[PDB]
Ligand binder design. Structure first.
Ligand code: ZN
Ligand code: ZN
Ligand code: ZN
Ligand code: ZN
Ligand code: ZN
Lengths: 122, 220
């Protein structure tokens, strides 16, 4: 029984009080878990199963950031409203006469959403 | 008399340009402050959907828009600059858009989109009011060539505002300035002709400056 109750950032297990008396738990045992809004399981859902592994809980990063690329008013808008996951870069382009602040071209989906925030300014 | 008119007409146009010197810059400061909000509203209000629907991002964009009645205060400054030429349509569209902000429904993305569509239409009206204000001052001159070059300029300038309101506004303001201050117009494109409407507008700005120059000269 190597795996104690899991601490899960941006979510947790279903049925905490029902399930806790059974911990710690054997390698091979798994449990339904959820991610809070704005967050996603690696299977791209609101829930998945977290497994007790010799190397600890798996997936190791159970909840990931869900960033929707915004409509940009004077921008090249191929990516408008498409879903991207935490870690993803996109190279952003404005119509001539408009540009991104600080002359930046790359925005990344991070813990708190897009960084920097992409907007086409005059 | 013809020269006492053309003198006043040259003075009216100069008083316009100085009063409205900052109109392009002021409209851009509004655009820049409110573009992220407008983007957030448009992003989660498409009927094609497939983007969850953070109604709290749309609710936050509407709050940013409404805050301290600021955007309305910012559009009314522009309505004040053009006033001698009667932006009567503009005053109502701002008063109407202010009511649109007052009557906005939290957790309704379709209303949010409608407030955002109203902002965009108002912003292009602010641009058109500047053109309409110029056409008024240019209507009072009598020279055949200047009146024909004025009509062609206003027509070509509205087509340019129809493509991009803010880009149109800056080249329009810079053209009036060039003519008011005895400078020739730069006909070189600033956007490798990305805006298909720039070149015909610039072509028209050069012909008007020659006709305006020709009038000025009768008085020197
Ligand atoms: Zn807990
Ligand atoms: Zn995280
Ligand atoms: Zn779409
Ligand atoms: Zn939210
Ligand atoms: Zn309405």
């Amino acid at each position: 029984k190597p795996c104690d109750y899991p601490d899960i950032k941006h979510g947790g297990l279903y049925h905490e009080n029902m399930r806790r008396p059974y911990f710690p738990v054997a390698v091979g045992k798994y449990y339904s878990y959820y991610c809070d809004e704005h967050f996603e399981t690696p299977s791209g859902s609101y829930w998945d199963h977290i497994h007790c592994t010799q190397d600890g809980w798996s997936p190791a990063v159970p909840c990931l950031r869900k960033c929707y690329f915004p409509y940009l008013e004077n921008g090249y808008n191929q990516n408008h409203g498409r879903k991207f996951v935490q870690g993803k870069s996109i190279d952003v382009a404005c119509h001539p006469g408009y540009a991104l602040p600080k002359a930046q071209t790359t925005v990344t989906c991070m813990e708190n959403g897009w960084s920097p925030t992409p907007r086409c300014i005059r | 008399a013809m020269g006492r008119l053309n003198q006043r007409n040259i003075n009216e146009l100069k008083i316009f340009f100085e009063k409205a010197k900052y109109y392009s810059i002021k409209l851009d400061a509004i655009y820049n402050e409110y573009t992220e909000a407008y983007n957030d509203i448009m992003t989660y209000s498409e009927v094609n959907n497939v983007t969850d629907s953070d109604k709290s991002k749309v609710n936050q964009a509407i709050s940013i828009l409404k805050k301290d009645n600021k955007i309305v205060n910012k559009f009314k400054e522009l309505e004040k600059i053009i006033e001698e030429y009667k932006p009567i349509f503009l005053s109502k569209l701002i008063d109407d858009f202010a009511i649109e902000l007052d009557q906005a429904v939290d957790n309704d993305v379709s209303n949010a989109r409608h407030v955002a569509d109203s902002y965009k239409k108002l912003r292009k009206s602010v641009v058109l009011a500047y053109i309409e204000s110029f056409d008024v001052i240019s209507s009072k001159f009598v020279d055949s060539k200047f009146v024909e070059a004025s009509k062609k300029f206003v027509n070509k300038a509205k087509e340019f505002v129809e493509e991009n309101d803010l880009i149109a506004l800056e080249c329009i303001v810079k053209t009036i300035g060039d003519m008011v201050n005895d400078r020739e117009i730069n006909s070189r494109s600033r956007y490798d002709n990305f805006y298909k409407k720039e070149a015909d507008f610039l072509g028209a700005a050069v012909e008007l400056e020659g006709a305006y120059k020709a009038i000025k000269q009768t008085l020197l």
